[PDB]
Paper text:
Amongst the Arabidopsis MSL channels, MSL10 is enigmatic in that it has two separable functional modalities, regulated cell death signaling conferred by its N-terminal soluble ‘death’ domain and force-activated ion channel activity imparted by its C-terminal portion. When heterologously expressed in Xenopus oocytes, MSL10 is indeed activated by membrane stretch and displays a preference for anions. In Arabidopsis, MSL10 is primarily expressed in the shoot apex, root tips, and vascular tissues, playing a critical role in adaptation to hypo-osmotic shock and induction of programmed cell death. Analogous to DmMSL10/FLYC1, each subunit of the heptameric AtMSL10 channel is composed of a transmembrane domain (TMD) with six membrane-spanning helices (TM1-TM6) and a characteristic C-terminal cytoplasmic domain (CTD) shared by all MscS homologs.
We expressed the full-length wild-type AtMSL10 channel, consisting of 734 amino acids, in Pichia pastoris and purified the channel to homogeneity for single-particle cryo-EM analysis. The channel core, consisting of TM3-TM6 and the cytoplasmic C-terminal domain, was well resolved in the cryo-EM density map and allowed unambiguous placement of most of the side chains. However, the N-terminal ‘death’ domain (residues 1–165), part of the cytoplasmic domain between TM4 and TM5, including residues 335–386, 397–431, and 469–480, and the C-terminal end (residues 732–734), were not resolved in the reconstruction, and thus were absent in the final refined atomic model. AtMSL10 assembles as a symmetric heptamer in that the cryo-EM reconstructions without applied symmetry (C1 symmetry) and with imposed C7 symmetry are essentially identical. In contrast, reconstructions of AtMSL10 in C1 or C7 symmetry indicated that all CLDs adopt the ‘down’ configuration. To evaluate the conformational state of the wild-type AtMSL10 structure, we calculated the pore radius using program HOLE36. Strikingly, pore radius estimation indicated a wide-open central ion conduction path. In contrast, the wild-type DmMSL10/FLYC1 channel, which is the closest ortholog of AtMSL10, has a minimum radius of 3.5 Å at the equivalent hydrophobic gate. Thus, comparison of the ion-conduction pore dimensions of these channels indicates that the AtMSL10 structure likely represents an open conformation, which is remarkable because the wild-type AtMSL10 structure was determined in the absence of applied membrane tension that is required for channel activation. The open AtMSL10 structure was determined in detergent micelles that were essentially devoid of membrane lipids. Consistently, we did not observe lipid-like densities surrounding the channel.
Author numbering:
A (entry chain A): 248 to 334, 387 to 396, 432 to 468, 481 to 731
B (entry chain B): 495 to 643
C (entry chain B): 693 to 731
């Protein structure tokens, strides 16, 4: 549509030029109005060109956001469509997009059949599709997680579109003001001295508003170019973890682990390093405990074996790979012990992370108690008088 | 090591491609404006207005362009690390992940993903384990003063 | 230190070895004695 209107207007301009190109001086007054009309036509042509470049910039930014998120958005949409069947166009579908779901899934599944009913899936989709898509409770939890992910994707799309809309509003404002001032200058309405006074006033306007414009440009470069996180991602800034809430071009809204709302200037964030749990691989855990220096090495080997068996017998929570080390020896009485193991998830699920860590710590405490590993204070020599 | 080398080559090529895209953009805009000026299409006053608007565009975008140029100078000229190298920044060890011209992605020892502005890294000192020689170890223990020599 | 896990495992092994060697030699640490006057 943009190129269509542009070519229409340029054809209008060239047609006007061809008709009046002939040297036919109807009247001196006619020449003045003809010059004014020509200047206005070329001014609106420049305005249309500015509109074209504006829409090109906005569309390339939208395409970058698409290459960033729309792939996962379409994947989630396809997964939701497949789940519903068992129980551009993609952009439009994404924009359009608990207990009840679990009850519906249970009703669909055959009574007294914990596993997913293959017959029901076969009647609704192909066997290969059902296998690719694939305990009723686990299926319900996965469906709830997929619904939450789709809601988060929709919120992220809305945030991106709102940021793009605000950027479009700002760019359109500057474009319109530039177009009107260009039309005024081409009409040649002001004298030289007044034009110089306007020039120095524009220089002062620049000197003043340019600091905030630089801040704004840095913020949008951080938001779009760097693009460190999406809406709903749990991120750490200056050592404190939060959750992304909004995507304003000049600020970002965060929720702390206590649900406290926070506001951060995007320019300030650009200077700081940013960490993202959602985009990170499976995260690592660490537990610290202390034991006496007199502990035999055999007990340490037994503890290592118990840790290994406990970690390998719980693959749904912990990866088999793990390490146990000694940090330092204090006064030849205390040994500092550290365990390292990786979850099957990231720190995005903070509550699940903490529950799993508590379970692992209690398990390690029980294993240490079983092995009779003890800690002791250094004996004190007292001389009476 | 071969996989890491391939990843490093891909990261370098992607950084070069982004740099090429940016340079091509500025080159194309400069070429079209040069063509317009040589065609002599605009009047003097409109040209002066365009000149002051370009001056304002410079005043605004030049801070970010300076940051970008510092970042690319740090990435290419200084070149302190490669992809997959384990480096220490501000006392914390990490692993290089990506080689963006304006940012670098790191993985901490807990596998946590981190983002650092390349301009900020340029100001800080950087340590690299991969490029370092065989490293030294140290162990501390305490004993009584009455211990015989 | 690129192989952080191997580095830490080797350091732990060395620390345990040093602990065993110190225990064999009967090298000990002691707190300073405290003088107490009853009333």
């Amino acid at each position: 549509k943009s190129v269509q209107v542009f070519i229409w207007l340029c054809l209008i301009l060239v047609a006007w030029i061809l008709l009046f190109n002939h040297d036919v001086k109807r009247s001196p007054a006619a020449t003045k109005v003809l010059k004014c009309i020509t200047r206005t036509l070329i001014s609106i042509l420049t305005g249309a060109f500015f509109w074209l470049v504006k829409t090109l910039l906005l569309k390339i930014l939208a395409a970058n956001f698409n290459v960033n998120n729309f792939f996962d958005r379409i994947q989630d949409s396809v997964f939701h469509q497949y789940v519903l069947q068992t129980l551009a166009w993609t952009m439009r579908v994404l924009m359009e997009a608990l207990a009840a779901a679990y009850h519906v899934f249970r009703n669909v599944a055959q009574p007294f059949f914990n596993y997913i009913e293959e017959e029901d899936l076969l009647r609704f989709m192909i066997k290969e599709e059902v296998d690719l898509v694939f305990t009723r409770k686990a299926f319900t939890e996965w469906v709830v997680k997929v619904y939450t992910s789709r809601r988060a994707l929709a919120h992220s799309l809305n945030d991106t579109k709102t940021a793009v809309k605000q950027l479009n509003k700002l760019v359109t404002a500057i474009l319109m003001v530039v177009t009107v001032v260009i039309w005024l200058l081409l009409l040649e309405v002001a004298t030289t001295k007044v034009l110089l006074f306007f020039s120095t006033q524009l220089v002062a306007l620049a000197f003043i508003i340019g600091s905030t414009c630089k801040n704004l440009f840095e913020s949008i470069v951080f938001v779009f170019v760097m693009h460190p996180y999406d809406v709903g991602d749990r991120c750490v800034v200056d050592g404190v973890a939060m959750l992304v809430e909004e995507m304003n071009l000049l600020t970002t809204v965060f929720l702390k682990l206590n649900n406290e709302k926070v506001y951060y200037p995007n320019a300030v964030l650009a200077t700081k390093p940013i960490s993202n749990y959602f985009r990170s691989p499976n995260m690592g855990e660490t537990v610290e405990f202390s034991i006496s220096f007199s502990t035999p090495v055999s007990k340490i080997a037994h503890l290592k074996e118990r840790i290994a068996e406990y970690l390998e017998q719980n693959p749904q929570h912990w990866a088999p790979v793990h390490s146990v080390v000694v940090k330092e020896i204090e006064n030849m009485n205390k040994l500092k012990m550290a365990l390292y193991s990786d979850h099957t998830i990231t720190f995005q699920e903070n509550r699940e992370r903490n529950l799993r860590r508590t379970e692992l710590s209690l398990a390690i405490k029980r294993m240490l108690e079983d092995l009779h590993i003890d800690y002791t204070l250094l004996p004190q020599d007292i001389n009476l008088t």
